Amino acid sequence: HLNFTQIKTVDELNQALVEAKGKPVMLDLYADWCVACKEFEKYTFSDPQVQKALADTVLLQANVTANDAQDVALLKHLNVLGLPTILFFDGQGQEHPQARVTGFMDAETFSAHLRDRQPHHHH
Numbered sequence: 001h002l003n004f005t006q007i008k009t010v011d012e013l014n015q016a017l018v019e020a021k022g023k024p025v026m027l028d029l030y031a032d033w034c035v036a037c038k039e040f041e042k043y044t045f046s047d048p049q050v051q052k053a054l055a056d057t058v059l060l061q062a063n064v065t066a067n068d069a070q071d072v073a074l075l076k077h078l079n080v081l082g083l084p085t086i087l088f089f090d091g092q093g094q095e096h097p098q099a100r101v102t103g104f105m106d107a108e109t110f111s112a113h114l115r116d117r118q119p120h121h122h123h
């Protein structure tokens with residue numbers, strides 16, 4: 001299992017981005033009933049290549065299983081249209097829409113997607 005930090009609300013996501021400033025971020029939107037989320041856990045997030053590729057990224061997760069009012073406000077704020085969705089933010093906190101993942105990807109494809117992100121190493 002990756003080590004995700006859970007957020008619930010828009011305000012919590014924004015505070016997590018403040019704290020992560022200087023490092024890239026991945027936000028996974030999760031629900032227990034979404035089969036592709038469980039397939040990410042089984043086939044992709046479980047693969048050592050992906051786990052090592054993400055070691056220097058801050059990992060956030062929003063569990064929207066209940067579809068409660070905070071969940072829905074968060075999804076709306078992010079203009080998320082369904083699950084699965086994974087968002088990527090750079091070291092300045094800027095989301096890059098082209099990097100959104102909106103269907104299952106296996107480990108090789110997800111790793112290649114990670115590699116394609118905006119450069120995020122300091123010097």
Ligand code: NA
Binds near residue numbers: 011
């Ligand atoms: Na804040």
Ligand code: NA
Binds near residue numbers: 096
């Ligand atoms: Na990017």
